[model samples]
Target: SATLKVSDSVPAPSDDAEQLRTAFEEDLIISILAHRSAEQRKVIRQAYHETYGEDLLKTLDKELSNDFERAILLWTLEPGERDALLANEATKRWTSSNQVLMEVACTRTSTQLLHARQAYHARYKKSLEEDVAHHTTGDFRKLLVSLVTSYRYEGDEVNMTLAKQEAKLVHEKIKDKHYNDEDVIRILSTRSKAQINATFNRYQDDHGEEILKSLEEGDDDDKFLALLRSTIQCLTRPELYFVDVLRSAINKTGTDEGALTRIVTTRAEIDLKVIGEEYQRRNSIPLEKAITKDTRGDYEKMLVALLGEDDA
Candidate 1:
């Protein structure tokens, strides 16, 4: 249910190149960048070069500034390339929280994640798993490394009896405060999505509470706790999880610009319409209106257009 409009007769890349030139001249880059797929953008990049004898990425890099420029440029790359770049950046800093890495590793399909890892190795000259291991430590490292390296079973077959039994295993470990139990990690990291859902549902049935509610918080600032909880949320209810991410990015006084840009660019072509509706349902304001209220100039325009709002 994505809302990105695909025109029946897309303008010729040469024509798009000319319009891009005019938009640059007029500082109207938003409209120029909006509503194009990655493939169309690739064509435009080629056409821009053939027409003007200039690299389109460098052209935008010089002409625009700040998060606006960054968001637009990220959108222009092929999706695998974009994800590779995002993951590479995340692995460099070694932070307590990394939503970008989480999104890249968790949201992508097994094949797509493999492509991203390939892209990462191609761009960085190092395996994604190697970099993740080198940059992180302790339970965080264990979980993230497994997540990046895993080739999850992408099947729909659910084992309800296995689900019921694993639900009890999960409960026992959690009740004993063994948050980093091997079984916990294995079940979450390796199981197919359908099996995970069945397991989570059975957990609820057996435990009389959501598995998330059963996790105990210790005094370690709960960084691992947060990471585990987010994994569950991303697995069982991604749209709701994304709605919260967007809401947090917008509702904050000075927006988390990185979070806002990442979510908008990453989900725009994927499931943005569903995210937008969930945002309105949760916040009582349209996602477009919220973006308009919080952001400005080309950044705001580019994001709203990505949401498929031409009138913004």
Candidate 2:
């Protein structure tokens, strides 16, 4: 495997509003949940105060109630958070639509979920899943609870049996599921590119239905499917890459700032060069051009700079 390095450059505070909104959302969540220092939290609190002209905790206090408030405040405090060892302690946890909004929308990492659950338990001494199940009903709630309980990854050794299983699960679910962002994200985020390709191919053979073909007629689903296909293709062949950023740009309605920032911030230090070349070959344009065109201003500049020298 090729080694990689991930890097980040903060945009000027003056240009903050010019950046993508999802990037701002991602930054807020990370600031609230991921920082380890009290000083960092204080700085974040001050920034929030400066930005919004309100006390952060008081604003949350006004906006939230019940277990949701507890979760947010605890998350805001971010002091007693823990890992998976304590993640399961949230049986007394509770949720409202607002709480679920923050929990499901704000959290992305398995570890972050773990800490959120820990914080939940410290406040309520109950499992977050049980609370989620109690407050919300139907496929949506079930899915959210399932996510909270952490069924996102069915990790096991890579082999024919596992591959076949993944294929079957995806096939069944794809037939039953459409336009569910939660399902798409859960499936995509959990699997490695290699696993995704294996699953995709196996699914095609087992179901006699191409998932991508099934995803036709809708642009959002198509773009997501494209990303998944690209990821899987990258894993399997050296030539498959993120070439269709052009399509994602012109089509998808929401700016997937979280997705973009997360990827480049993490991958820049790693096989980004390989990813870039793969994108160039797969898309029929230079990867740098794609990034520059899709993104605006400093974000575009920082991401392009991260691409570094073209040593080829």
Candidate 3:
């Protein structure tokens, strides 16, 4: 899913570092860094430090500012570190509108989520659980804390009978408005993705409606319920979850750069290509063009550079 190609330049990191020291032009920076893969960037950073006796990241931190600085920095960091920082940021500035915690928890593979937790511990000197637990209240705390700490079984094994029983259990609890029932949380936080997805399918098939649709209790103001809905969406089909995020980020009155940056920078190496094509198909505007019209200057340039590399 990575748009990046291995560096094809001659003289490799030594020259790249030299150029980085000698030049700080925006286009030059993007052209070099954007085209390079993760391992290539690490070597470039090392070469920069070894040659200049200063950290390249620190230099860039001083040299850049605003959203461009953020875009580039997030793009450049290792994924584990980035997810850790983003999770911490989400906790610090959390609100009902924020779904960063759930998004991070649900979208990643189990091992990948575990890596983020490890990175979290290394960076924050504590568990993601403690932060999430203390920062959120009640049901949010319950669901998110369980989610971050969970190490789900990743396998193809499923119990259709169990899915049926659990779907009925889930539906009845949801029908009772026991949204925070431990049983519901148990099924979602513990079950394999295939199992959980099957349970959702069984709910729809047996109950004759989508669980997400049925959860719509004639309102959009139910914050915890809204999170629950998106949680299901993210767990079942993250591409659609991403599409909803991207559309709102783009189509809203002033645009949502936070969501825009998170989605693009994180997914660029994973599913941005899939997300962009889907975005274009659904919105009838090229995702590049959508962003082009909504953003400008260096911020626009860096994201566009990532978006442009989606072709075969």
Candidate 4:
């Protein structure tokens, strides 16, 4: 279960901000902010910014010693706004951190992504496409701009006729590795999900190999190959990608806090419930337990709190 819910009140948003401003403990802060929905907190954050002259987020940071715990606290803030703020930063820094762009593009509901862009333009006063275009070129440009601009088919219906045709076409592109000439990009970008799912099914059935399987032969050094695989997963099997990030980050020597924070933060509002189930299926360790084992700092106690609870 996502485990975050409103605690029942209709406080003046500013009054709530004032309470938060009395400046609080890490636990008391989580008890309040993490339980709130975005719009509720969004209103208060605005109040915290305008009336108090500093964001509640900055307030949290000012109270907490420095950054890591502060980073974790941000998961308590609004989701769509986080994406806009984060994505806008990635583009400005010219990091080609284009993977962040793809995840935001492929994973969010079409409207959610649209609203995030709404935030981007309002806050940053620039289209996401404009920033990404100036920062990227070549294949990254194709996938990034297409996914950013093309609102895909959101219906659950499938068209097997086109699915079969494109399935065969996609296989041939992979075989020749000309796929990056914008061929697989268009198919993955423009089609409906069920239709894409059917195509992957037909590809495996007809070719006797999973679309993802043989591509390990994409020569291994293929960073573009890596990006495409991640793109496809984000489109279809996103929770798997998320669980992979968590376990990969957890098992590393020092732990990859960046990946740890991003997955937990982004999915906390969405499907963290299922991502944990997927983690348990794959890891034998339940995700909540696994995260508890890996993280320390507030010793990140409330990061585990946001996980809600587990079926196991």
lDDT of each: 0.78, 0.45, 0.79, 0.71
- Steric clash pairs (candidate 3): none
Give the lowest summed-lDDT range of ten residues in model 4: 59-68
Candidate 1 is scored at a TM of: 0.91
**Against the true structure, what is each candidate's TM-score?**
0.91, 0.41, 0.91, 0.86
Error of 2 at 52 (Å): 26
Q: Cα-based RMSD of the predictions, in order?
A: 2.5, 11.5, 2.7, 3.5
Instruction: Residues 143-235, candidate 4: write the lDDT tens digits.
Output: 888887767778888878778788888888788886486767888888877777888988888889877786867874665777687787888
Ranking by lDDT: 3, 1, 4, 2
- Residue pairs with colliding backbones in model 4 are none
CA displacement after TM-score superposition, residue 287 of candidate 4 (Å): 1.8
- In the range 173-232, model 2's lDDT, one tens digit per residue, is 566655444545465445644455666677778777666666554455343344344433
Model 2 misses residue 171 by how many Å?
3.8
Mark the 10 consecutive residues where model 2 has the least summed lDDT: 96-105
Sort order, TM-score high to low: 1, 3, 4, 2
Which of 2 and 3 is the better model by lDDT?
Answer: 3
For model 1, give the 10-residue run with minimal summed lDDT: 56-65
